[PDB]
Amino acid sequence: GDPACRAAVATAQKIAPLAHGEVAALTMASAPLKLPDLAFEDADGKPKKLSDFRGKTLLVNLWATWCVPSRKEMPALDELQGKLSGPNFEVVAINIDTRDPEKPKTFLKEANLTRLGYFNDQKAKVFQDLKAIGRALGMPTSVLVDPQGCEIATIAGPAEWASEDALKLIRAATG
Amino acid sequence: FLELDVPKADLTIKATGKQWYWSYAYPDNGKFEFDSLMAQDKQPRLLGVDNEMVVPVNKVIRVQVTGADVIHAFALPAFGVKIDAIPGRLNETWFKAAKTGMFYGQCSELSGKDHAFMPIAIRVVEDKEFASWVETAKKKFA
């Protein structure tokens, strides 16, 4: 419990009925949880933290080139960014490959995905940080995060993140 | 589920793992069986398989698993399922879906190798939709 995180719980309860179809595996938060302040770099190697994104709802995803389902959903996350990013929402996809810093960028370039930037943690510590709070059982993992850095929902798997189901859920969560 | 109770299945499905796919058999619904392989040329879909493991929502599902060749893990976090499919052995657990839709598995956190990803795809539908799916599956996978 962090009392700042109750509003995130209230959102999760409100949007729970939309967590179905292509996004059925989302598990709504039923207790306030403040996420660890994940540390990662941007495409330029500049240091970033989750808290740098406060003020917006986020979809935080962890992905790696060695995980097939995490590769596969990347174009959905890029399309979701395209449709919904703005003042109130952003997708933050963090690559966690730990060898060959360039293979992930090549993956994105060859898939022609340009809307997600290139957030990365070559230590893959962000995975260990979410695993510690019981929010990373495998790959991919994604977390829907409120403007305060609090958990709305988590999914331990891939999903069609640009489907209508996904879009309706995110819009409900946002604004 | 109350942990202290013995769960009682409304439906049983048998999942057999092999290098590198799952096959599902429905002993209570005519004994048909089918392989579940990673789909392709199903654009503009990005995820999934040709034939999903389909189940009715709000019913107790028993999943019996075995391995054809080597040990494979059958896991689906949203349903609390994490069980090993071991050759020569029939392991079981039970789950119940509370929501309809699609449920896909994960890679383990260990980097793993080389055509070896075996997708798990479970599709949860309502009662009428399940009955209808069964009737069609009886003919299709005979």
From Swiss-Prot, chain A:
Thioredoxin domain boundaries: 29-175
Domain of life: Bacteria
GO cellular component: plasma membrane
Key word Transmembrane helix present: yes
Subcellular location: Cell membrane
Gene Ontology terms describing biological process: cytochrome complex assembly
GO molecular function terms attached to this record: disulfide oxidoreductase activity
Sorted UniProt keywords: Cell membrane, Cytochrome c-type biogenesis, Disulfide bond, Membrane, Redox-active center, Transmembrane, Transmembrane helix
Signal peptide boundaries: none
Topology, Periplasmic side: 1-175
Chief localization: membrane
Membrane topology field: Single-pass type II membrane protein
Disulfide bonds: 5-150, 67-70
Function: Involved in cytochrome aa3 assembly.
Subunit structure: Monomer.
UniProt-recorded name of the protein: Thiol:disulfide interchange protein TlpA
Organism: Bradyrhizobium diazoefficiens (strain JCM 10833 / BCRC 13528 / IAM 13628 / NBRC 14792 / USDA 110)
Gene (name only): tlpA
